[PDB]
Amino acid sequence: ADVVTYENAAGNVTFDHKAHAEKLGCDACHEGTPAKIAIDKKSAHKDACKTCHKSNNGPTKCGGCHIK
Ligand code: HEC
Ligand code: HEC
Ligand code: HEC
DSSP, X not given: OOOOOOOOTTOOOOOOTTTTXXXXXXXXXXXXXXXXXXXXXXXXXXXXXXXXXXXXXXXXXXXXXXXX
């Protein structure tokens, strides 16, 4: 799987299916069985993606995940 890119009115968000994985190892987003995790404007803001970002030397503010 390759760079998907979610295009949204608040800024596109770069779903790096490859580029994150190349460092992460799939596992990081996927407990053994990878599958289509539902992402939305709660999920992506509470814990999915966020909580890794919270506990990583990476961006966390809106305009550090959304393009602007
Ligand atoms: C966390 C940021 C991810 C990384 C890195 C990988 N995947 Fe992923 N995957 C992620 C999400 C949020 C989703 C949902 C995509 C959507 O818009 O629905 C997925 C989905 C998959 C799927 C399911 C595809 C389907 O059958 O509908 C697969 C098979 C999958 N991801 C595989 C996969 C592998 C092998 C990864 C390492 C190369 C990998 N993902 C990384 C989130 C993330
Ligand atoms: C990545 C680490 C994110 C951070 C930080 C923020 N957002 Fe986000 N947002 C993210 C994703 C993966 C998505 C998926 C698309 C969807 O519609 O849910 C979103 C989406 C939004 C949207 C919806 C835009 C639309 O066209 O309706 C909004 C309004 C939004 N995000 C706002 C938002 C704000 C204000 C943030 C800082 C508090 C913010 N997001 C951070 C991923 C990420
Ligand atoms: C850890 C398990 C992560 C998950 C889950 C997600 N991301 Fe991530 N992201 C992570 C790291 C360690 C980094 C690199 C930080 C650095 O500065 O080296 C990132 C980076 C991003 C970026 C920045 C690149 C860009 O396109 O500008 C974005 C936008 C980003 N991450 C988005 C993102 C989204 C939307 C996620 C799920 C839908 C997501 N990340 C998950 C670590 C992890």
